[PDB]
């Protein structure tokens, strides 16, 4: 139906690829199978190789490199791609190890990226950027500061864009009066070769007087709208400079992304809950 094509200025080498975002099922990565369509006269003696790179940047810390000898030779999609091209189209087949850092970067490049580089040479080009990504497969906190603060989330896993509900229960039996309540979202993006990030803050002047009970659900939603000017914000994989989401929550070497909800009473008693923020398998 569809297939991504990329070739060199000479066009002697062409790479045909089925997908460009391979879902990490956590037990099997969609194999990187493509097709190299060469002209015999431009390679003659020199061989044709294809390389799968998993470069980590910030410094080119190539966490993985694998070369597949397209020619001489060493899937149904590959079959159909070849039948339209003949002999001088040769398949390649890379397998991403499950234990790799998913495609993630930072909003200013920096981060992680996969790559398919196809080159013809006698001994060990088309630069096809792919990505490894994951799909979406009850938090409760209580702190007795007395100043009893309890916070719960309806569910742990929320899709991007989907709003998060925060059930708050403050039983203020002490002499101190709550001045504000802040339900904030913290995005921790650890670069492993951990920094906090506030992305959403529904600060409300809700004051709970002594020996009182306060209880209502807040609705907070982390969006790229107001995060555009946050250096080091973890964004998902950018194919050729598209506009991307918030780095999904890694499910465990590269960059680890975690998301938590913090409930703070500005009097300070606080609690925190983790939530998962990956897109749903369409």
């Amino acid at each position: 139906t569809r297939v991504f094509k990329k070739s060199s200025p000479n066009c002697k080498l062409t790479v045909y690829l089925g997908k460009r975002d391979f879902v990490d099922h956590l037990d099997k990565v969609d194999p990187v199978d493509g097709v190299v369509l060469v002209d015999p006269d431009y390679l003659k003696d020199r061989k044709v190789f294809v390389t799968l790179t998993c470069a980590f940047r910030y410094f080119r810390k190539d966490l993985f490199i694998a070369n597949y000898q397209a020619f001489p030779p060493t899937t149904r999609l590959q079959e159909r791609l070849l039948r339209k091209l003949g002999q001088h189209a040769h398949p390649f087949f890379f397998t991403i190890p499950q234990n790799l850092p998913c495609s993630v970067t930072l909003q200013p490049a920096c981060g992680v990226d996969f790559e398919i580089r196809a080159f013809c040479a006698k001994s060990l080009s088309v630069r096809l950027v792919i990505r490894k990504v994951q799909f979406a497969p009850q938090p409760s906190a209580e702190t007795t500061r007395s100043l009893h603060l309890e916070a719960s989330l309806d569910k742990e896993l929320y899709y991007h864009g989907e709003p998060l509900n925060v059930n708050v229960h403050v039983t203020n039996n002490s002499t101190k009066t709550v001045k504000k309540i802040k339900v904030s979202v913290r995005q921790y993006a650890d670069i492993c070769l951990q920094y906090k990030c506030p992305v959403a803050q529904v600060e409300q002047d809700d004051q709970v007087s002594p020996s009182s009970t306060f209880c209502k659900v807040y609705t907070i939603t982390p969006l790229l709208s107001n995060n555009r000017e946050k250096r080091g914000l973890a964004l998902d994989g950018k194919l050729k400079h598209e506009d991307t989401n918030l780095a999904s929550s890694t499910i465990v070497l590269g960059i680890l992304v975690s998301y938590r909800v913090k409930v703070k009473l500005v009097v300070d008693v606080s609690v925190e809950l983790p939530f998962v923020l990956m897109h749903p398998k369409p």
Partner: antibody
Amino acid sequence: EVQLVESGGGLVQPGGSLRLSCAASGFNVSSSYIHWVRQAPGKGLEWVASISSYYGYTYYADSVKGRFTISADTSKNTAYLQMNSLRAEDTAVYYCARKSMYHRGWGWLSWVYGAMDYWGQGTLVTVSS
Amino acid sequence: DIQMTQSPSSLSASVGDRVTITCRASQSVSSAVAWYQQKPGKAPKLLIYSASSLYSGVPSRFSGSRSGTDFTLTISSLQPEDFATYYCQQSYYYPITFGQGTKVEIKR
């Protein structure tokens, strides 16, 4: 099921102002490009404005740039279009529809602005002195 | 903008006829086209997307295709219920632009 409910349609003198609320059921205003279109009396549709919450992307037609202003409330899951300096020519039936950002295969297609596959019912906006 | 011209301005046909409406874009489009079958008064109903994709739920009699910048909408059997206006809309750039309607009347 996905639906949009368009409300806020009543008379207003020219130079007045209105506000139309498009409440979205079955999806979120953060994972969809919401477009306010209109149809004058006995004419063809015209695109008025279109927004996306997640990126904070706003787009206005050249004829309704500055006079109209769109935004959304993700807490209520709704899209609010404020119409200012309403004129007789702005009279129409105003529709609200959505383009899901999904179906890229994995995630958001930030650059489709595709065909609006779900329309509301259209609320009649008048202007007359 | 993109003056998404359409032809004919209107056409007539009975049951079983094969209507053909051509949507021509002033500037290049890249399969971003949709065809809305606005019944009189009601809200426009999506028919085609990607310039050739039968939108889910639209009857198979409808069809669309591309031959460059001039997309075509065809109806294999113009049923008595397939009488409305058909607007073509490029979803590529902004501001989006629609066609100008091509009413599909009845003949006597």
